[PDB]
Coordinates of C-alpha atoms and ligand atoms in Angstrom, one line a residue:
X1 CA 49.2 121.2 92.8
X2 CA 48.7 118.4 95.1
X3 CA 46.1 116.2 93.4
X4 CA 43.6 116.5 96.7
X5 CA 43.5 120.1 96.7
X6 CA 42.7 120.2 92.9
X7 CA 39.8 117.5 93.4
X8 CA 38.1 119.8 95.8
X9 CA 38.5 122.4 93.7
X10 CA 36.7 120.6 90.7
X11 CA 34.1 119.3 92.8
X12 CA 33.1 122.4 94.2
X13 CA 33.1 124.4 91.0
X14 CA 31.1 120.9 89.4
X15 CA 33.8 121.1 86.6
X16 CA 34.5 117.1 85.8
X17 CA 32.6 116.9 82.6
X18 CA 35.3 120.2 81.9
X19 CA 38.0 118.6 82.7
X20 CA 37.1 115.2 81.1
X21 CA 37.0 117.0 77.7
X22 CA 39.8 118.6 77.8
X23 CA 41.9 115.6 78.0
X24 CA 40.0 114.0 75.1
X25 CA 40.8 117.1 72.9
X26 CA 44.6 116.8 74.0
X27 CA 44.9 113.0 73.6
X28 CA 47.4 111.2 70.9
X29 CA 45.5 110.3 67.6
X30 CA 47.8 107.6 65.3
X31 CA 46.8 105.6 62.9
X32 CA 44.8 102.4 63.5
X33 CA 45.1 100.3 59.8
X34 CA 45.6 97.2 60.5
X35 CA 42.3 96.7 62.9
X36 CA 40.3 98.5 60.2
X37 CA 41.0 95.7 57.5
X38 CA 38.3 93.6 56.2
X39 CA 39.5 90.6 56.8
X40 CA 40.3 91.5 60.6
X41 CA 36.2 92.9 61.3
X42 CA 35.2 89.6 63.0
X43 CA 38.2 90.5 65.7
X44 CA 36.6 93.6 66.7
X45 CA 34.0 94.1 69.4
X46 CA 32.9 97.6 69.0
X47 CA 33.7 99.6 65.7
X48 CA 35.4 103.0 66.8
X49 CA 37.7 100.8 69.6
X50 CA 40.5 99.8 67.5
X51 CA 44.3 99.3 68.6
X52 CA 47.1 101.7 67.5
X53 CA 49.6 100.5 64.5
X54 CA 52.5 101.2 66.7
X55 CA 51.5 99.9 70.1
X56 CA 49.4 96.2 69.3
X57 CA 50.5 93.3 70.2
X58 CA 51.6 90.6 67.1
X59 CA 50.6 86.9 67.4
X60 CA 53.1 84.7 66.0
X61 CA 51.7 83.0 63.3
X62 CA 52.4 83.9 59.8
X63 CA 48.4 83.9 58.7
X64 CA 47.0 86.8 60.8
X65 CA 48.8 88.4 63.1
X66 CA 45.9 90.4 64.3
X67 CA 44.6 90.9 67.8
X68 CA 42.4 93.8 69.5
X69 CA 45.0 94.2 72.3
X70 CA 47.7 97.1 72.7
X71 CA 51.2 97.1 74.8
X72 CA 51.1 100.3 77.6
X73 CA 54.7 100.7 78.3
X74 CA 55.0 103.6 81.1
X75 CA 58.5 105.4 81.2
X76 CA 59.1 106.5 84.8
X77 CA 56.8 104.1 86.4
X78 CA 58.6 100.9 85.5
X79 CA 55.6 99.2 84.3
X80 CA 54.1 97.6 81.6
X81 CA 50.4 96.4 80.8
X82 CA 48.5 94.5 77.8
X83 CA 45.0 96.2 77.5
X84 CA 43.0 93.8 75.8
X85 CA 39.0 93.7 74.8
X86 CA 36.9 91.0 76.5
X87 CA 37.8 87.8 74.3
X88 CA 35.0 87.3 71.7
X89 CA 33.7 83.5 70.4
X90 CA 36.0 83.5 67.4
X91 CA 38.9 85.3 69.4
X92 CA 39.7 82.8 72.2
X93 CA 41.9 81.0 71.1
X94 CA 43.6 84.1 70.1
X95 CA 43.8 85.4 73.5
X96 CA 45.8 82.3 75.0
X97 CA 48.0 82.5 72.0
X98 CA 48.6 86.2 73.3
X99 CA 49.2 85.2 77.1
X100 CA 51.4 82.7 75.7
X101 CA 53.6 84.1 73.6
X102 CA 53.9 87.2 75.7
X103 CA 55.0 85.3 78.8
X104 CA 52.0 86.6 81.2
X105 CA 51.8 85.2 85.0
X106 CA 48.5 87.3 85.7
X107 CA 44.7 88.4 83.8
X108 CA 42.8 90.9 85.2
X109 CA 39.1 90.9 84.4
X110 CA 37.0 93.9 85.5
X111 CA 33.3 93.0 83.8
X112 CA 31.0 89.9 84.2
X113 CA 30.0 88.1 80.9
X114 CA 26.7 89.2 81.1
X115 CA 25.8 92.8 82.0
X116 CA 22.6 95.0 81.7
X117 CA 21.2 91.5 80.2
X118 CA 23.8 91.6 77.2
X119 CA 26.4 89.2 76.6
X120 CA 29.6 91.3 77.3
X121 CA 32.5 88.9 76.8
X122 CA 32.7 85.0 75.9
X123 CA 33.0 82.4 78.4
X124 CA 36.9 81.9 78.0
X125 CA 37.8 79.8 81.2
X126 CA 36.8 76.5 82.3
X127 CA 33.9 76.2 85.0
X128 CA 34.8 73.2 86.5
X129 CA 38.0 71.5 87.2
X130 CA 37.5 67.9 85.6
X131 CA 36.1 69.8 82.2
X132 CA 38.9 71.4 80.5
X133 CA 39.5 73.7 77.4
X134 CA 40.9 72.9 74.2
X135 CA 41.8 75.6 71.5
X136 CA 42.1 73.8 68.3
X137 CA 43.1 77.1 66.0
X138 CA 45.7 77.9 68.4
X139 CA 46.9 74.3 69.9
X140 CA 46.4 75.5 73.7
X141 CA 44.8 73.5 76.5
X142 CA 43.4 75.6 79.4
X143 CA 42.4 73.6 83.1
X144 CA 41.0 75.4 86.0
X145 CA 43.3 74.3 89.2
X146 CA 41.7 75.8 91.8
X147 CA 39.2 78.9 92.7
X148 CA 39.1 81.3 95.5
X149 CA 35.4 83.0 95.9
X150 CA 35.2 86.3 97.3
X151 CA 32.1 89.1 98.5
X152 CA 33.3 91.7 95.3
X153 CA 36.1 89.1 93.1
X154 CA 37.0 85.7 92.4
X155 CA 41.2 84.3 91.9
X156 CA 41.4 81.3 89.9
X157 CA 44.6 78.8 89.4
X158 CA 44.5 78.3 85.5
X159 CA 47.2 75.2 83.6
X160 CA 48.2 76.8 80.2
X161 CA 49.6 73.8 78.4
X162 CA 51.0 74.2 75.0
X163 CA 50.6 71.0 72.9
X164 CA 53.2 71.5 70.6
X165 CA 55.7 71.6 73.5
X166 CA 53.8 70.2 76.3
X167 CA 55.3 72.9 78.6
X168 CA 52.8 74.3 81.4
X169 CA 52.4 77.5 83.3
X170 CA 50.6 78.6 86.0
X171 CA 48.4 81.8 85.6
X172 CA 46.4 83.6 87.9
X173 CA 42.8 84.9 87.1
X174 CA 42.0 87.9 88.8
X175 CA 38.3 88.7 88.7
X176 CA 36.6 91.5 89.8
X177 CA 32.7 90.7 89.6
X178 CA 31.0 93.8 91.3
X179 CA 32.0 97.3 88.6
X180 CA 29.3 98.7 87.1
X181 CA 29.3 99.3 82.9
X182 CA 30.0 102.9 82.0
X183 CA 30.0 102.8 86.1
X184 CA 32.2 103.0 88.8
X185 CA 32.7 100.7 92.0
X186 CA 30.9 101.9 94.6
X187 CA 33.6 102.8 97.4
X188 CA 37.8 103.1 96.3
X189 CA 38.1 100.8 99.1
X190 CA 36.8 97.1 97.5
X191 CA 38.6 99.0 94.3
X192 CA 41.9 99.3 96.1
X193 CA 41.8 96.0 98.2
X194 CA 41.5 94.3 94.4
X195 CA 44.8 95.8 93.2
X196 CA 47.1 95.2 96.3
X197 CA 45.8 91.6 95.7
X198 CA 46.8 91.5 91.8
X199 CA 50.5 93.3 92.7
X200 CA 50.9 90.7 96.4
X201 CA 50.4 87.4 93.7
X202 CA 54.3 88.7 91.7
X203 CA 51.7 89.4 88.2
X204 CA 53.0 92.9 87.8
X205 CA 56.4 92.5 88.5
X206 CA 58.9 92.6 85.7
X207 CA 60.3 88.8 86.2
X208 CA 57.0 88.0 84.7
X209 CA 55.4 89.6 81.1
X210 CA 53.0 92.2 80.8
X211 CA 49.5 91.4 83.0
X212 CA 46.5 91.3 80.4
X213 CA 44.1 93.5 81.2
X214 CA 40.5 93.8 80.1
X215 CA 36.9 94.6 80.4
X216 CA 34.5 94.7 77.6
X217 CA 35.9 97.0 75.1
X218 CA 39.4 97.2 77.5
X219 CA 39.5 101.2 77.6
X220 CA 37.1 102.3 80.7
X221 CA 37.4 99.9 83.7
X222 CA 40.7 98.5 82.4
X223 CA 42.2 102.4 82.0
X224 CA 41.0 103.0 85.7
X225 CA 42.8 100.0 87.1
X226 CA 46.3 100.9 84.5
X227 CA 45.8 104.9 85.6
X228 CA 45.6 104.3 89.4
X229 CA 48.1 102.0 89.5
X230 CA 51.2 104.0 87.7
X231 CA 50.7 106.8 89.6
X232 CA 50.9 105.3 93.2
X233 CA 53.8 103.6 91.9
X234 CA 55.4 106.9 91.0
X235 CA 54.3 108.7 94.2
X236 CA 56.3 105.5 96.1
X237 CA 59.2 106.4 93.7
X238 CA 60.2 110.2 93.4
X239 CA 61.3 112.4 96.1
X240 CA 58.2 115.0 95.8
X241 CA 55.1 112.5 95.8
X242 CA 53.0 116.1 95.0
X243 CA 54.6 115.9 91.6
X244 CA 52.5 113.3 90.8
X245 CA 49.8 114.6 88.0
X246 CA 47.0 112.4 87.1
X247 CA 45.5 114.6 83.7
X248 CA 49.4 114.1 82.7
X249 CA 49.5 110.3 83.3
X250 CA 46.5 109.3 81.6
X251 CA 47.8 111.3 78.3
X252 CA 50.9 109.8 78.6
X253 CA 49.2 106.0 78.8
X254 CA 46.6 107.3 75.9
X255 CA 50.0 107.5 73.2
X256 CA 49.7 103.6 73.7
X257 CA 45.5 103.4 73.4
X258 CA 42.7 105.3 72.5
X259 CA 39.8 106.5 74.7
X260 CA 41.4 105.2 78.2
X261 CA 38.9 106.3 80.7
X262 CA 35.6 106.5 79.3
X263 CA 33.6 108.4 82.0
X264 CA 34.0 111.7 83.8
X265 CA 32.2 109.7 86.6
X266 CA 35.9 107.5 85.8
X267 CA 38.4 109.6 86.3
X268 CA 37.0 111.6 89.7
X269 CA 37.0 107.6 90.9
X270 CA 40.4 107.6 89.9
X271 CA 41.8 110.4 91.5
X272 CA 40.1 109.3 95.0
X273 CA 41.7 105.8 94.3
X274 CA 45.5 107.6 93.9
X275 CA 44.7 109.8 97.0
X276 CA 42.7 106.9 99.7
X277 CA 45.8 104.7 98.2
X278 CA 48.6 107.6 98.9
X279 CA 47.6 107.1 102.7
X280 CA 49.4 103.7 102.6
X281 CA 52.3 104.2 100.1
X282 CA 53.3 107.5 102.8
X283 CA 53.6 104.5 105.6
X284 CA 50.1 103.7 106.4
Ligands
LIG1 C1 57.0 108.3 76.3 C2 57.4 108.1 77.8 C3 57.4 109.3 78.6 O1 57.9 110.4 78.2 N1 56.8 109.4 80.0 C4 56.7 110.4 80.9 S1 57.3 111.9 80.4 N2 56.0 110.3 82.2 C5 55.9 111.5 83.1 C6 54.6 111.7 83.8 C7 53.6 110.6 83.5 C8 54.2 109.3 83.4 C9 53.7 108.2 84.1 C10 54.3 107.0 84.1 C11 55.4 106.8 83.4 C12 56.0 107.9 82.8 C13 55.4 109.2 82.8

């Protein structure tokens, strides 16, 4: 049922809250055991957001391994995604171990670090381009290059060096500075314009590893951004673009983490994100 049709549908009959349900009584549940031991509760933000067994990603380092950060491998689409919680004071160092080690070009950031006057995520990038980050747990050294400033979001040119090594990367910060918590942004349009920006810079093509993706717990805003983006992918790929179901999609990217999409107010902004979007993959 073409996805516009059913939207309509919904809206008229006031149904979202219906639908929205439905999906969380249908979505995967596997166990989460490593995130729930004791010595791993300082790596957690919120209590009941935890990572899969199956699906998180592994820090090399024989000590801890542990991470609040899970792998999103999508079958048809092609595409693969690290959502990752917003980086917490003892957890930073972690992180850049993670873009590291997972050979990342790109980080998506969908939340400010303060929001509704709360701190929601640590300060994990430098500020200024002669006062650079060191990670002593991890052996990392982080330098902002450069910094384009925007009406809605921000790109940043970040120096990854590893001082073991002394190799270097380049990685792009892609910052999106205007989303609402437990909100949406306001029209698909600033939404869209984002993501054509993040896929232009190469961060989510597969020469490069997995994007990190995150808000503050990575599930809501960082689910909207994964959702929308697989399935205009998919309607650029198969031969009936209609095919394309959104409900099915998200269940298929919740197997790989829980509670993606944390709204009903979410996922009504994600389907008009898939359709406004559709306009240009069908040659607009
Ligand atoms: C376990 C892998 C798998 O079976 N994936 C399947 S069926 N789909 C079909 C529809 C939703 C979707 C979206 C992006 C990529 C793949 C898929």
């Amino acid at each position: 049922m073409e996805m516009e049709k059913e939207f309509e549908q919904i809206d008229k009959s006031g149904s979202w809250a219906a639908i929205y349900q439905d999906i969380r009584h249908e979505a995967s549940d596997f166990p989460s055991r490593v995130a729930k031991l004791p010595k791993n509760k300082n790596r957690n933000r919120y209590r009941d957001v935890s990572p899969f067994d199956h699906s998180r990603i592994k820090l090399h380092q024989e000590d801890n391994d542990y991470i609040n950060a899970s792998l999103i491998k999508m079958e048809e689409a092609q595409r693969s995604y690290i959502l990752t919680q917003g980086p917490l004071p003892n957890t930073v160092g972690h992180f850049w171990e993670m873009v590291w080690e997972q050979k990342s070009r790109g980080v998506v950031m969908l939340n400010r670090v303060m929001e509704k006057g709360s701190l929601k995520c640590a300060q994990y990038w430098p500020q200024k381009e002669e006062k650079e980050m060191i990670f002593e747990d991890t052996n990392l050294k982080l330098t902002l290059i450069s910094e384009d400033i925007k009406s809605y979001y921000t790109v940043r040119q970040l120096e990854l060096e590893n001082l073991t090594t002394q190799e270097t990367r380049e990685i792009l910060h892609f910052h999106y500075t205007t989303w609402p918590d437990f909100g949406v942004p306001e029209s698909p349009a600033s939404f869209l314009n984002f993501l054509f920006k993040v896929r232009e810079s190469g961060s989510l093509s597969p020469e490069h590893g997995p994007v990190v993706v995150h808000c503050s717990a990575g599930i809501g805003r960082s689910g909207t951004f994964c959702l929308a983006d697989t399935c205009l992918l998919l309607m650029d790929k198969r031969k009936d673009p209609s095919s394309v179901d959104i409900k099915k999609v998200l269940l298929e990217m919740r197997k790989f983490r829980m509670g993606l999409i944390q709204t009903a107010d979410q996922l009504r902004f994600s389907y008009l994100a898939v359709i406004e979007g559709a306009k240009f993959i069908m040659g607009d």
